[PDB]
RNA sequence: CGCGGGGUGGAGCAGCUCGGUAGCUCGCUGGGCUCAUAACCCAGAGGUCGCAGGUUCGAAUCCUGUCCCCGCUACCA
RNA sequence: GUUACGGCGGUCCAUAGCGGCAGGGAAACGCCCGGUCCCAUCCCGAACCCGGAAGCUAAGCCUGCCAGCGCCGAUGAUACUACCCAUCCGGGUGGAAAAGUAGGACACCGCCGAACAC
RNA sequence: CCGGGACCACCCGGUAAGCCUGAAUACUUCCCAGUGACCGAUAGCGGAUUAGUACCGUGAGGGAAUGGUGAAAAGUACCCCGGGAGGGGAGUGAAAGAGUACCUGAAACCGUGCGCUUACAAUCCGUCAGAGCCCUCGACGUGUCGUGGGGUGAUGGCGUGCCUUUUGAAGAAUGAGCCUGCGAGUCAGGGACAUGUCGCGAGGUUAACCCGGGUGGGGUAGCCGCAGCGAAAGCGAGUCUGAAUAGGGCGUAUCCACACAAGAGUGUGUGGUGUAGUGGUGUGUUCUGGACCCGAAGCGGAGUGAUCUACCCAUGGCCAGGGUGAAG
RNA sequence: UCAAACUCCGUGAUAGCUGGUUCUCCCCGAAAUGCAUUUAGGUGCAGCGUCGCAUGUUUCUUGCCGGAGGUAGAGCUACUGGAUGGCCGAUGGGCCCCACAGGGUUACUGACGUCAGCCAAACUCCGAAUGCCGGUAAGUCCAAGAGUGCGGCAGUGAGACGGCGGGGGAUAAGCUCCGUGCGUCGAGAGGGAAACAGCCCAGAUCGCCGGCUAAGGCCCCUAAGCGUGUGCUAAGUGGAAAAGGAUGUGCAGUCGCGAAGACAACCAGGAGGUUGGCUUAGAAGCAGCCACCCUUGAAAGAGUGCGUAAUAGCUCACUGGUCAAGUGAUUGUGCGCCGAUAAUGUAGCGGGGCUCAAGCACACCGCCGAAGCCGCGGCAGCCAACGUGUUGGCUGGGUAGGGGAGCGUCCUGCAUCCGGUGAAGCCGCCGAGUGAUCGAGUGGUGGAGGGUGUGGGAGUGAGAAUGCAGGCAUGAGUAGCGAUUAGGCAAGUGAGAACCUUGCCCGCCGAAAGACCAAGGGUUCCUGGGCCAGGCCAGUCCGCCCAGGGUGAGUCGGGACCUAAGGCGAGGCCG
RNA sequence: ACAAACCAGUGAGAAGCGACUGUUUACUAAAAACACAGGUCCGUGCGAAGUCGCAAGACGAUGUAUACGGACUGACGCCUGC
RNA sequence: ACUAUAACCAUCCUAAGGUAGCGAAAUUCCUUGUCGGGUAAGUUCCGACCUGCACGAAUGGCGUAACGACUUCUCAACUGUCUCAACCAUAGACUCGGCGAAAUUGCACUACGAGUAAAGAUGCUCGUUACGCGCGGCAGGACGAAAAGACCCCGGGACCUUCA
RNA sequence: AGUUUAACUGGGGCGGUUGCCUCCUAAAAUGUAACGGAGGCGCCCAAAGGUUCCCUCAACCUGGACGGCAAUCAGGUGUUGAGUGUAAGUGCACAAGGGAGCUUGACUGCGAGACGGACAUGUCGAGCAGGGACGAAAGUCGGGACUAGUGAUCCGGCACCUCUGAGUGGAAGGGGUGUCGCUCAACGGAUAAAAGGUACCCCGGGGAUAACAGGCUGAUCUUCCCCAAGAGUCCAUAUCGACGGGAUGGUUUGGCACCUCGAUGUCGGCUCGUCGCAUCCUGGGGCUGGAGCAGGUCCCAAGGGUUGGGCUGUUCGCCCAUUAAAGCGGCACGCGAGCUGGGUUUAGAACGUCGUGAGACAGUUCGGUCUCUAUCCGCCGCGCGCGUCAGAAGCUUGAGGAAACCUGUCCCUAGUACGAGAGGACCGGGACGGACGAACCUCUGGUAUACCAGUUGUCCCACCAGGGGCACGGCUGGAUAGCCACGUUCGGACAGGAUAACCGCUGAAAGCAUCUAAGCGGGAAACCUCUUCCAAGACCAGGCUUCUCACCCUCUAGGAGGGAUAAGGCCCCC
């Protein structure tokens, strides 16, 4: 016999590439995703792809607002 | 089969705790 | 070891999806020619390739299980 | 500063909702009156927009009443579980610990403005 | 007329279709004189020897092995055993433990003799403990003891060869009968990369070649460094992209201090410090080469073979005896 | 020798294949994964190792903090799907009013909805633990010999089993494929497991006739206990096994009854109605079935069964008594029983043997037990400290593999030394070194070149290649000693006779095993002599060895005569 | 016991294949395979065709279509269809 | 018109649809087809049927006398082929003397059982058995010797074929 | 003529697959394999892109002309279940879904920083400028809600460029920028260009990988078993025992691919066996729907026995006759250094079929080399040595082993029991037998290599005669011994003990009952004894007896060594 199947895509490598705290630089990805599971909010950005770049410097906090989880990031303060 | 079964049950054994190579 | 393969009016055969499936011959029905078949005329009549699913709006048509007589099935040591 | 108040926002956006049954119209929000003007309907001055102030809080909005429906929801226990012990017991230790359930939880916070107060 | 890298023009160079021409250059069958951080008899030529011999093959062709007495044969007269061989005495000799089987004379292998052990035992053959026996060295005292050493090993414990290749082998997977010899990362190159070391040093170095009976001295042609960016023209601590003073790429050896901009990750200017390569050589990898060694089946070139065998040609020979009984 | 001969050459053909690759020690130490591949047993790169350089704790562990997830689990009236039973009841099917519509009604189906209980890797209103990312504080910190970057050199890129989570498979495989800061083997010895790579303990620097331990064990084999206490087990369970069967036993209960006499036994009674009805020819306390009553009364069952053709008789359940207290039914557990069942020989404890436990459970006490740890001593590597080489700490299993340092051999430059008053080599003795190995220590043999130091260069180390050559073993004093005729006696010779010689017999061939030629061989012929090789034994013999001799042609066979096939082939043609 | 020993046919029936005698895999196959005579087809008009050869040249053949070569079939009989 | 088949018909396709003859065949899977013969009994054999998996007319078909070291079957005779084996001789084997190999070989004072193990053990475990050494014999094992498995696969060749 | 003709592959082939995307597997980061589970892609859109603005569905209810479940209309409920170009997932109702207007950013130059990462690929990207679109403006726009919709490099083409221009000016050609051309789909793409056969085969390798066997597993298979719906006149269990369930065994087909491919020889037969019992017969027994004969079923039992033939290579099977019975299996489907070699499984040839063909066929057919001196273990036999506490001898015991162990027919019991009859016994006695084995050779029979006779041919002994040699002892006919079977005789036992299944007794625990727990018995061809044989190497090396039961020498007389002897034995000899 034989199996109709036996195909399957390259993974992606999609997920949280930034968790919370840690400090990023601008244009950082947070966030590899397919949808807006995780949706942009304070100083980041939505790519083609529904990618979350940071737009600023800093720590990256997850947050919820109306619902949605939205990724921010939140200042730095320096000494 | 009689041979498999006691190279198995020999890994009920105080020494070997239950786990041997091959079970 | 295992694989493979078309179905449609009663019979035999066609027809691949612009949104219907149908058409041919034979058969059958009614009439006529004949004193009574064949050959002629038709109002001629006649089928859901079985169900499930389409991207379906809709599929004989396309895709899968089934629809199943199918040519080839062949482990060579 | 006080409002049965008008906006602009916020919350791990439902403890906030829905549905109650009884209420309000000070300014305001509103319905509401008309389409002459900007503007508008793939038709419609319904809407959008404009000009207005006849009457009405009926509705929206707002206030009070709530466990009726939904939402939240511990604790403890259980399941599951990393490590460990244990010669099958998936047994047991010390840690973490749900879901469901049950007990119980019914909007709040800020800024401005309005009328009044002052 | 030809060439100047299609081609055309200009310019330049040259003057084909005619010939000759030494030296510098390549090589060594052979001859002479020499050298070797070359071999030294399983090496070195195949061949130190009967060597392209013997031998193999029809043939082309393949293709061995075999060195050493001693300083001098003085090579053992003579006697004895013996058919002889071979030996023992005697002699030669420095030595016959140098006797044409001969320098030294290992191992495998074969024996002989002495000691210990072994015929009730299940043995990867040994190891550890160890009785008893034997030998030895010392001591004391006279044979028991020791800081002992050796050989044997009763007996007890433990114990599954080596290599290769494997997930894994004692492995009933491979290879090896044993000993002795031989038998596999080497060589060349201004090679490549890296590293070490030495020399010189913003320079380093020569190659060919010349002179030197040498390993030494000359030899600047080149090579690598010394400025990069760019497709390139080109520009140059800048350059490319680009409309850009607008950003980026590459580069400006590196570091220090300051100043100014920024805190998008730090940058920009100034000053200073000032950049380290190159050639020898060793080592490790690597390139081209047979490239660590052995190993195919097979491919090609040129030849040898039909004295085997297949077929054919020419010329000869052979087919007892007995039957059957065609045509005519 | 032929699906394309042989020989030489190309050629040292090439082989992703197999094999082999030679001395030592010190330190470190893998992989069997990913991606790609005319690729899958190869290779490149990455990963993993080593070395060097640079950086320096960045690594790693733990605590805390910030975070994202959608697994386990759970849930589904929270979606998609599945799906059980009810309830309602659309819907249809029928029926009746009977038309056609509209009606009621249903033996039925019965959607939707709802009540309750459920399921899912590709379902999720939910949702862990872990792990992961990041931060932070500490720890280790004379070390993990970490991490990162660069570069030199790699090897690996066939993995295995086991634990856990999973796929495929029959939720079989000592199966296969994955995952797992999981392990071990690989590449890891030692102890236990009887033996037994992957299980347990534990990671081997060396030595010791010292100690403590781990796992596992303490009757004898076999070191340590026929240990102590309380129970259990009767099956040698232990020292294999299922569904399931089962008055096994112990414990813990629970329930019914019970001296107002229980259960058991012994004595006496134990129904009428009535056949309660159907059904069979019948039905009755009893083929079979519907109901499953009442009544005298203790007790009487719609009868407990037998016996029964139906009945009877039989005893029953039940009632009363005689003695006289436990009795009966069940629940869970701890040990057990059966089920149990292969083939060389006990053979499913490793063995003996064990219940007078040496078995099981729970506690307790000691001990044995390793190359672990400790102790004493030695060595090495890394590091530190201090001093210009000692001490101390830590470490020291190791395959591929990397790095480092060395032994030995030969040839050599230089400098030295030894040697016919005996070098090398070989054999030994006595010894030495951490190792390859050493011996300017000794003797023996031997007879002429060697040693040392410092450098230089290597045909530099073999145990393996079904390696090459030589020599020698094992088999083994074994097979065989070569036909199908057959040898024997006497005498001789001679050192020696089965074999030679002579004679006599016997036997074999006799279209041959006789005689003659050719081809081929080449002196093998003859005489004399010899006997260490050869002859498959021996040998006085020989086709062997040595010497000498021997082959006479007009007519034989050939040339000088002839031509055949065929060959060479002047010139020539062709190329 | 008279073919005396030695020497010296076994025979019969039937089927398949191949007609036959022969040939063959030296060294595991002797056969139903090959060949065969016979047949058909095709080619060849002559230093033919075909073949060896670069060519010359040669065989074919000192032959000339009743011959030569190649292919298939394989005595003979009946046949050889589309 | 019983049934069975189908002389016959319809339809589709074809370049044409296999004629004669043969047929479980040297061809027939099913299959030891079925029937008959032979046999006490016959998967073989003979004859016949035709449902020809997958005959067929010069890759000739169907037959065929004669022929065959062909293949198959049957029968007579014959026999040690057998029931069922016995005996005799000879050559070896055996013994003595003499000469004197070989393949093989990691070793060796090379047991058996049940196990274990790279899953089939002389070599390990636990036991059992066994005085040491030979001679003739047998061949169960030493996964015995021989030949770097020819089958299979991988890799590479060679030769062969062809509309590569 | 040179070459190609892919790989993965639970051996290979055939089949299938090869790249990309989505999900699950996947173990809550990422990632993660399988010929694991499901699907999709090799496009489309000039709007289905951008922007501004607006809207919110599907479903359901109700009412409405055609109009119906469902077209379009109205109202209501409806927070999302619709729809999103297209697979799936993630998302999207704040809309990324629906509609309209304007448009071309489906731009140029660039890109901080990141993701992913063997490499090559790939992905996001704020932001600066240019010049634009939309928008009042903020702002958004470098294609699409996202993720697939694609192809490296070489080579060459086209357009543009203030690059280069082989002496110079040009040109050619080259170069840059943009872009095009490959189902190179085996999708990291050997060549621009390529299919097959080998049984004529070869080489290198592999147990990395199949066939045999082994091993594991045990789906399948086999042998049992649990429940018992039931069939069985009733009655579940005399017997069969469905649906279902649990296991044994490891013999079947298989799965795995663990040893072995520098060789583990294959089926079947022959020979030789050996083992197990899941027993075919014989033996013992329980139950029976067992009257008796005969059975059925179950239990115990492996001592022995378990035929010869036809067909087939066959195992198996069918058949023929028989039998007491014609067992099932293991031991490398036992056994090829023991045999065969008919088959399978080389090379030849042929048929059919497939293939253009070479060639192929778990299709057929005819034919077709079976090597080896036994070293070790083992086994069968036989010796040598030593020991068994002096040497020797005779006779022995029997631990412990080996062998053997079969069975029928007939008769009487008795035509009785039983039974309507048909028919027909148990138990117990007797005879005769088959097969197997041992011993023996009187018989019979075979053989007879120095017997006798006859006889053919030939040669010889001078010849006749008589004989001999040779011809298979020449052939024939006979044949004592020995060897032997076809022959003779004998054997297997009887009996006892302990037991299995089973039958029980006495009896409790448990006032009864109970084959048992204490006790006691019976009980089979199995077991032990018995019969035969070997046997004290029976290392506990035995026992009863008998014989010799005695000298010297040397070492320094310690413990030995040497010699000569006895009893006796050995060798030589017959």
């Known amino acids: ?3 109709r199947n036996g195909r399957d895509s390259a993974a992606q490598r999609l997920g949280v590439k930034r ?3 840690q400090v990023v630089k601008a244009g950082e990805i947070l966030v590899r995703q397919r949808g807006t ?3 942009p ?3 980041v950005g939505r ?3 529904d990618t979350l770049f940071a737009l ?4 990256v906090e997850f947050g919820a607002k109306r619902g949605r ?3 921010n990031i939140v200042p730095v303060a320096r000494p | 089969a009689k041979r498999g079964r006691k190279k198995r049950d020999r ?4 020494a070997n705790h239950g786990k041997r190579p091959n079970a």
């Open chain 1, 47 to 49: 790519g083609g792809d």
């Open chain 1, 1 to 3: 016999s034989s199996s």
């Open chain 1, 56 to 59: 600023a410097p800093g720590a």
């Open chain 2, 11 to 14: 890994k009920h054994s105080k």
């Open chain 1, 19 to 21: 968790f919370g705290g």
């Open chain 1, 69 to 71: 989880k939205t990724v």
């Open chain 1, 37 to 39: 599971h995780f949706h």
């Open chain 1, 41 to 43: 909010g304070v100083n």
